[PDB]
Structure formats: structure tokens, C-alpha cells
Ligand binder design. Structure first.
Ligand SMILES: O=c1ccn(Cc2cn([C@@H]3O[C@@H](CO)[C@H](O)[C@H]3O)nn2)c(=O)[nH]1
Length: 124
């Protein structure tokens, strides 16, 4: 079965590209990472840094999670990311997304042993 750590990697890691996300990027990535299988996942962020750099965030700046839990961490450095946001005319199964590249500090929730990212909370 898929671990929470693996699920974070599938939903949120894309080290392979630096940013260059075409306007098509989210349409393709949301589908291929299986985030459009059951419904159109409304919002999702992919991070284009190494897995080591993203895992490292779990030992960086401790901040409150949006849900009030205390296990979130904000990257000290900005990171290359792409936000995917479902369009207003998007209708499942043909899920459609606006693709927006940015360089921002990521906030992730970490859990487990080893202590690794399991949710993407926000970018700031
Ligand atoms: O700027 C953002 C803000 C929220 N999110 C949501 C998210 C959370 N997660 C975490 O892992 C998923 C495991 O099912 C959950 O939806 C959430 O805990 N995945 N996507 C962004 O991707 N970018």
C-alpha cells in the first residue's frame, strides 16, 4: 500500500523540471499523478526542488498548520513550485487547471519516523 510519505511524493514532488511548466502542465500532471481519478482535486502544488531539499524542510522553521496542528514547517529558502487551480469551466472527468509557476517558501506538515513531509499546507 501507498505510505503517506509516498503519497506526498506523488502529489507534490516534481524535481524533473526546474519550473518550465507549460500552460498545459497542470492539465497533464494532475491527470498523470492520479489527482483527477475520482473528482477534480481543486488545488494542488508541485515542488521542483530535490527530494532531499524538500525532506529537509521538516527540520526547518516550525510554524502552525492551517488546521491548528503544530507539525508544520516553512522552508528557509524560496523554492521553485507550480500551483494548479481548477478552472471555473472545468467539469470532471475532463479536469482543467490554470498553471502558475512561482518561487515561494513552502509550508509542509511532517510526520513519522523518519520525520518526512506528508502534507503540503501552504506557500508564502
Ligand atoms: O498552496 C497549496 C495549499 C494546499 N495544498 C493542498 C494539499 C494538501 N495535501 C496533503 O496531502 C493530501 C493527502 O491526501 C491531503 O489532501 C493534504 O493533507 N495535498 N495537497 C496545495 O497543494 N497547495
Amino acid at each position: 500500500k501507498e505510505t503517506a510519505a509516498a503519497k506526498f511524493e506523488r502529489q507534490h514532488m516534481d524535481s524533473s523540471t526546474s519550473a518550465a511548466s507549460s500552460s498545459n502542465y497542470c492539465n497533464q500532471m494532475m491527470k498523470s499523478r492520479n489527482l483527477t481519478k475520482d473528482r477534480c482535486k481543486p488545488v494542488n502544488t508541485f515542488v521542483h526542488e530535490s527530494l532531499a531539499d524538500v525532506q529537509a524542510v521538516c527540520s526547518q522553521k516550525n510554524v502552525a498548520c492551517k488546521n491548528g496542528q503544530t507539525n508544520c514547517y516553512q522552508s528557509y529558502s524560496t523554492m521553485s513550485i507550480t500551483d494548479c487551480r481548477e478552472t471555473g469551466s472545468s467539469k470532471y472527468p475532463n479536469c482543467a487547471y490554470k498553471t502558475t509557476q512561482a518561487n515561494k517558501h513552502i509550508i509542509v506538515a511532517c510526520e513519522g519516523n523518519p520525520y518526512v513531509p506528508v502534507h503540503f499546507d501552504a506557500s508564502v
